[PDB]
Amino acid sequence: MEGVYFNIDNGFIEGVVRGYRNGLLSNNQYINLTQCDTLEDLKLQLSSTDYGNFLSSVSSESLTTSLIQEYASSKLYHEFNYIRDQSSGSTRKFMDYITYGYMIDNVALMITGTIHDRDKGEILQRCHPLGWFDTLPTLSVATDLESLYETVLVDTPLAPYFKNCFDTAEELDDMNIEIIRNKLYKAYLEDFYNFVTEEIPEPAKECMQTLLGFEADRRSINIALNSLQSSDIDPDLKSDLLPNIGKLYPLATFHLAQAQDFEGVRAALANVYEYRGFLETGNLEDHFYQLEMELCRDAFTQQFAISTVWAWMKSKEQEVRNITWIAECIAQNQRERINNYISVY
Amino acid sequence: MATALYTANDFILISLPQNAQPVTAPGSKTDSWFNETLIGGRAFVSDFKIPEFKIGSLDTLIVESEELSKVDNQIGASIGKIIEILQGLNETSTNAYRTLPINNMPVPEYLENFQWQTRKFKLDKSIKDLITLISNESSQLDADVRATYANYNSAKTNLAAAERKKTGDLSVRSLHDIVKPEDFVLNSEHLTTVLVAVPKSLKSDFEKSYETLSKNVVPASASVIAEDAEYVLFNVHLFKKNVQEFTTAAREKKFIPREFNYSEELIDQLKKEHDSAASLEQSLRVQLVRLAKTAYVDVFINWFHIKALRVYVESVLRYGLPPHFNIKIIAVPPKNLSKCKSELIDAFGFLGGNAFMKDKKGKINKQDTSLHQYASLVDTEYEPFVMYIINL
């Protein structure tokens, strides 16, 4: 049941998201765009959408690397940064937390990056609550954990980073890129779960519930596949073990994650999942995308729901990437490797 | 227990010394016990008496077992892929090729008449050459079946791209089978034809607009030559200079032009692509189905050649002398394997160890541990007498 509540606040966040979804690239468009190889045709399809605004500005029949990145950055400012500020209540909060959770991977990478020494300025696009002009640099200069805690308290509302810092004190996060990121993701998915649990009584989660679990299963099998034949430390959570309702089990994920080859698991898991277990790294990669792409669209059937807006954000990240992938091939007159091969969005 | 079960019988291959006597039935005969006593008499025994071979020395013997284990597993895997290539092709559906003939003799009937095959594998040859010949044959055959199934999958992809071009969805499609000399004019160079892919809503919008898109647009040319669900495909004739104005004007209205001229070579080559793609997939599929079936039999004869060899050499390693062994293939009816395996262990187990023996049952395959894999190259759990479990 949803729409069994009257909300001043939910009404604003839901309409503004619907307003964007109108001009937004449909499933049919993406299907048309792969077929293309004509420079002019790619422009036309896109001119007409939310992304089309930026395309019009500088008119380029062959789209280079830079143009694509600039258009996506522009597009995340109107759609995500802005929206939060004219939104209020529990609905603005839910948007802040999803944006901040994405920020925790980006900012974590910037901090870790200082330790390695690296060049900074503009950092590649993600959905972040405030740009790289506000929050991310202020967090970045503190590499000292003690000062991290203090810097999060200045941010009103609080970031997740405050908990993440508590943890890295007691050394449950260790060092090295791969292990940290696996723990940051484990927390990320854990926060999704706590929110649904509080949120559910007035806007139910049906479509969202199925998508959140299928997303979780995919993320974890993917992390495991990555650390299969590359080295894996067995007592660490580099297997991405996290609660589940029984769709993916801790045992079956652990078997895959270690270096012993455990391709079988994927096949047994699938009965309606796209990924079915293959010997081709590339074919696995294709399937992952299509699965996670489905059920977001289904979520749109619901409305007046926390379910709708969540599924939409996660679809947007997958569309910005599709645009990039297709656009570049057509530019230098080649066809797509991953996108031409996938056919279900 | 199982690993690719259809309706095929499961087999246990055993070998024993000629002094061995069961302790489960004392004073009884081994040959009689297998048929009569063994899992309530529902045990069907078939001969499978493997000849003598050239056995190496003691140092060479360790190395002969190590290789038999590896090669055995390769052949076993590779056959598993061939069965799969068929299953996917729909050449194995209900049951096919696990009970089907093996040179005009079914699989269970073939094992009973299998005693060693002197097809090219000789006992005047060394052991070493027998492992190298059989294994090479098995690898090479799998590689050809794999190369054709890859090529067939590619070939399907080309044909699918082609049908859609020849009619389906417009975004890359240009028509070439619906040509006509007047709905498609180009014979000098003054007139040309531009085709316009128009969404259904927009169909009225095109019929009204067509004349205004550029100057010198031929009258009443706008007709739907072809129509699909999402789109309606129009032809309009106009002057060549004007084609640039026409196309740009078309894109403002929010149509999508599809450029195709009526050059003779164009029409012919697209048509050709459809045909050439159907002929490639067709020829290939017939050779490919045939090639796997022919490969399947050969890798079957070769899988059993290693096992026979493997079992023989092993028997020599574990019991010692006599080099003359009493060897059988026992057909177990499906799901009685565990009960069969246990009974054999109790009777015969004392021979190979009076303390190196424990009760065990069935066959479990894993990469969790290396234990329970019954092999002489990796550490496993030691069986009390030579017994190998075959799952079909």
Next chain:
Amino acid sequence: AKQKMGRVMQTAAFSLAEVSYATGENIGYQVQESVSTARFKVRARQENVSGVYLSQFESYIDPEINDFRLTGLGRGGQQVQRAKEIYSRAVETLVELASLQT
């Protein structure tokens, strides 16, 4: 061989570029810390082509050298994992062809 290397280098470069942009972080920074060895190296030989000794090279891939840890980033990690595999194949081309140049 110049034309052939160029096609291979542009194709491997574009697949790597796509991946860098999709993940939303620059992989190359991550990659620069981890590079501290080289898998593909050359071993030098002098070869008599007529009376004169010319430099020839024969390439070796170290099998004692593990995969670097730039994977496990989540969904972004899958993308790098596929990426290195095309690139090791590609890079081998450039070196084997390069032996004639010297």
Next chain:
Amino acid sequence: KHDIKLYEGDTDKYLDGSGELYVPPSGSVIDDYVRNASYLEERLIQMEDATDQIEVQKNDLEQYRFILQSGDEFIAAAIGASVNYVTGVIARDKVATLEQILWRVLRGNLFFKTVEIEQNAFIVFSHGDLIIKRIRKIAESLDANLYDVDSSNEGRSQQLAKVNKNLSDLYTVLKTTSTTLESELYAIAKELDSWFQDVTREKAIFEILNKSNYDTNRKILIAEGWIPRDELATLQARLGEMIARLGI
């Protein structure tokens, strides 16, 4: 190294009983203290590495004593070379089973397994002289010391005879090391506290005096004065409320 732990919170005074005793009322000469610690640092580093190298060799040869004696008796091939024996130590008879399991699966029953309890486990495998390397591969992978012949000392006939004289060198050479270390330990424990207090006191003088610009932009007055030494005592009694009366 000494297994004496640091005493701290520091005496630098001349009020105290210890203050007078472990810190001389005289001046300090940095050069002397550096040279004193130099000689001791060098001696220890030799002593510590030498105890470990000598000690390890001894523990092994004493272990392989009993091993070569038992293994020769188990006889008519004690100094043989046409028969292969494998003598070996293993931590416990439990670890030995796992070895037995590899052997039996991967090499056949070409062993005779015997075991004697030590204090460790003496395990013995006995084999052909042309299947050695394969046994060796098993032995390496489960952490066993099964060597063909244990010890690099074999050279008298019997093997053991050489081993027993080399075990008498090892025992007496370790003991001499222990004595030099002990002697020096009793000698310098007390001295180390005194030099430590002395060195603290040197840091403090330099700081008082201004040895860097920072001490300067934090306190700007440094005064001078003369205190009789028979009265040095009373000045140190009150350390100074926000004044440093640590002196020479």
Next chain:
Amino acid sequence: AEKRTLIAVIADEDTTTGLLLAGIGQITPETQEKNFFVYQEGKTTKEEITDKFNHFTEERDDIAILLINQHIAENIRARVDSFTNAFPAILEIPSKDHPYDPEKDSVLKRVRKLF
């Protein structure tokens, strides 16, 4: 002969990143100086490429083969042409989104005259 087993790179950022992942170059553990040089197209002055050129060819000696992008190699045309040695090898390959040109290829010019 053997005294060199690194392949150094002067190339655009993506091409270089890729090449390193594949394992060719390195950041040394006792010089702490890169044995590759990344380039931001048009954003990096022609003078910085030249320092880096000298570095791989002369100031380093563990460089076997020097790879260099045609777009970049052209900017610093003078220095490349003047380098005629075989130790390290100069091999110009097309830049990213740039096609072959025989005249961005230092060696091909050299060979053509005085054949």
